[PDB]
Amino acid sequence: LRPCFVSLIDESDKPILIYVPNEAENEMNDVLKYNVLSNISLDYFESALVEWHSLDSKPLLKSIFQLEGVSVFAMLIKQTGLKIVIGFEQKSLSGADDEFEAINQIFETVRKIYIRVKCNPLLVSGDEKSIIKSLERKFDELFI
């Protein structure tokens, strides 16, 4: 149920953070094979194969593709233009339908910690390093 990478993309081409669990050991972990999926994920927002219909007020979840044994899920929260991508492999997946709501729990509990981190008053306005550091300690609190 635990993810293999998370990704937050703002309204430009930039990433806010590309965080993987367990950086402390190598363990055949390639950040390179994670960033290529994050680079093509921002491409596949504009694809006509999937679409986020806006009639429901609640932001929804999709399943854009699956490469290298890893399935990724987008969360294009509509209003502030933030794009979120979380990745999971087939061995963590059980293939059921009850897990889909728990995936949406993981999506909203990382959106909550993003809006709580970026609404810190004492950080200076601008893309500091401290937003990245605070995000990764809150993520390592969430993910051992």
């Binding site: 309204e11 806006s54 009639l55 007020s57 509509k78 209003q79 502030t80 809006i115 609404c119 008053p121």
Partner: protein, 202 residues
């Protein structure tokens, strides 16, 4: 629909909202770059002014220093407006996507929700020139009901009320620049018709 989640009093917020203005006058007139009072702390002394004397110091303020004050008020309204809009995001309003091509559709958001959240009530009227200039109206702006005018000196009282208007200037500027850009936005007066203030945007 009826969410009863935790809450505090309206009155302490409204009076903190009111004393943000002499906080800005105190932070500008005392920048510590080299009648008042004095207080006793342990091996320590502060020296203060009281609020209404500082609003009277705004009545005797320098002209360039007055607009040096008013940038700070829209800056603090800008900060609380963008952060408050960012919390509204959790509400998941279905009106808008980004960059506000249909500008009045998010004017139907701010009057319905944002002014409801800060001041407990809707904006009662909005008029639409279709060049982007939109005409706000409310009959009673909430944090100036407690400001008592003095006896028959209303020409001073207008000049001492309207520098409290830069905070909702900051509010609507901050919720616009949370959604992408900065365009021109000013105040009005609009003497009310039945027993307060109007706003222009682009």
């Amino acid at each position: 629909f009826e969410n009863s989640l935790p809450k505090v009093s309206q009155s302490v917020y409204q009076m903190l909202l009111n004393e943000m203005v002499p906080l800005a006058m105190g932070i500008e007139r005392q920048i510590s770059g080299d009648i008042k009072r004095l207080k006793i702390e342990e091996h320590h002394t502060v020296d203060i002014i009281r609020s209404h004397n500082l609003i009277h110091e705004l009545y005797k303020a320098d002209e360039e220093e007055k607009e040096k004050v008013l940038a700070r008020l829209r800056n603090i309204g800008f900060q609380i407006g963008l952060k408050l809009s960012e919390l509204l995001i959790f509400s998941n309003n279905p009106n808008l996507k980004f960059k506000e091509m249909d500008l009045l559709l998010i004017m139907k958001f701010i009057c319905r929700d944002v002014w409801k959240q800060i001041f407990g009530k809707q904006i009662d009227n909005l008029k639409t020139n279709h060049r982007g200039t939109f005409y706000l109206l409310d009959y009673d702006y909430r944090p100036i009901q407690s400001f008592s005018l003095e006896e028959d000196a209303k020409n001073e009282e207008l000049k001492m009320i309207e520098p409290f208007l830069e905070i909702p200037v900051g509010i609507i500027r901050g919720v616009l620049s949370s959604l992408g850009y900065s365009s021109e936005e000013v105040i009005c007066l609009a003497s009310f018709i039945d027993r307060g203030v109007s706003f222009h945007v682009q």
